[PDB]
């Protein structure tokens, strides 16, 4: 049958965002972590978007039925401090995260944003490895692709250099060398490299719906058209797309998980004023390849399935 719509809202504070895919091998279920932002909350400022955790929401049924299970609550250093958009890959046994990090509870943008760098073995349980130097102390929205080398390659936005999207390279997950901006075309956010119909594919969020790029060699990216731009006619699916995640299930079968703010405004002082704006839902829609680019149809039905990895 066709997904849910919206596929899932947070029952603690309504704020779930940046969703993350990822199956969960252990208890054979699919796992959505998201940013929880405190959007049922009357707050000073900018708060709302700090002092998150992380949100899991389950389904055990390929995707029909979705539960909220609890959070991941990381620490780093002492205090509240607030855990943005994480990257998750299985990997040799391990679940691997790259997690942005903005130090206390801000009331507006002015503080720092690393990247840092927790495993586990069960996606409940998470152990702190180290903090990414990449090219600023003001960087989030990690997203990983392993190339055929064998080297893993990290998308991020620099907001200290003009919010373009800029990529990095590991061999051991843990340490990473800058290779340098990888989009300089627009400022945006929540990269999402992935492989279909034999090119890379990247997703940004330049906050006009999202942006399209392919590739030959995830270095060279030629721009499409955006997607999630128009409203969809789905329950909380009325506005742009934001922050997506991609799940391959086949040559043929590509999901889109992104976010909507379904009460719009966004970019408006009213936004900020008024907190019926702040809260989010998580989506799904099905990806298509028409005429050599990736694109999608909101509206459009289909029947969706999670299935179990083997
Ligand atoms: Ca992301
Ligand atoms: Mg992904």
Redesign the pocket.
């Known amino acids: 049958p066709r997904p849910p719509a919206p596929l899932f809202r947070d029952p603690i504070y309504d704020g779930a965002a ?1 969703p ?1 895919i990822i199956y969960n091998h252990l208890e054979k279920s699919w796992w959505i972590l998201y940013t929880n932002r405190r959007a049922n909350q009357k707050l000073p400022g900018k708060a709302f978007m700090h002092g998150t955790d992380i949100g899991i929401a389950e389904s055990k049924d390929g995707g029909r039925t979705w539960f909220y299970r609890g959070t991941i609550e990381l620490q780093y250093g002492r205090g509240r401090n607030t855990f943005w ?3 998750v890959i299985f990997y040799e046994g391990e679940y691997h995260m790259y997690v942005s990090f903005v130090p206390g509870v801000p009331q507006d943008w002015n503080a720092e944003r690393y990247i840092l760098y927790y495993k586990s073995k069960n996606l409940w349980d998470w152990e702190f490895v180290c903090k990414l130097e990449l090219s600023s102390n003001k960087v989030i ?3 990983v692709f392993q190339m055929p080398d064998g080297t893993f390659r990290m998308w991020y936005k620099d907001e200290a250099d003009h919010s373009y999207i800029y990529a990095a390279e590991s061999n051991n997950l843990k340490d990473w060398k800058i290779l340098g901006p990888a989009l300089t075309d627009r400022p945006q956010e ?3 490299v992935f492989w279909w119909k034999s090119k890379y594919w990247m997703i940004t969020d330049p906050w006009c719906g999202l942006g399209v790029y392919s590739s030959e060699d995830a270095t060279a990216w030629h721009r499409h058209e955006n997607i999630l731009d128009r409203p969809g006619k789905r329950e909380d699916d009325g506005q742009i797309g934001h ?3 991609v799940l391959v299930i086949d040559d043929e079968t590509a999901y889109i998980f992104y976010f909507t703010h379904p009460e719009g405004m966004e970019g408006t002082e009213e936004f900020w004023k008024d907190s019926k704006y702040w809260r989010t839902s998580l989506q799904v829609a099905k990806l298509e390849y028409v005429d050599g680019k990736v694109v999608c149809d909101r509206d459009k039905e289909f029947d969706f399935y999670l299935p179990d990895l083997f």
């Open positions: 940046d993350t958009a994480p990257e929205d990690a997203c929540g990269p999402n922050h997506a995640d």
